Amino acid sequence: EGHLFKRASNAFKTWSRRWFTIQSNQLVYQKKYKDPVTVVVDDLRLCTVKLCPDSERRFCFEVVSTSKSCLLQADSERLLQLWVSAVQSSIAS
């Protein structure tokens, strides 16, 4: 569970920081403290994980699943590899 940056659903697609949880082969995001969560990808066993070497954006990954995709961006090269490996173990569940 931890902080990540993502892109908004506004017409400019502006970047924004939210707190994300990986649990029970699912990825959810928290929308306020002490309030119900929203699902980001329905399942992780049906995801692939993009390490994005040709992107302009720095420390970013992309998680692409059958019903839903999400671009995300972390604060360090450590955190990229640790969020990419957590999804990658999750994809093997």
Partner: protein
Amino acid sequence: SMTVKLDFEECLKDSPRFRASIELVEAEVSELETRLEKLLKLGTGLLESGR
């Protein structure tokens, strides 16, 4: 012109980024059809010229 892959956040809050993207995708659709339909009469004309 507008940004690619227009996602649902902007759509449902009636943003000006949405408001301008919808302005510009319709104007792109009028240019596109006209150029396709020109490319269509010109590819018609090409076969007629070949034949």
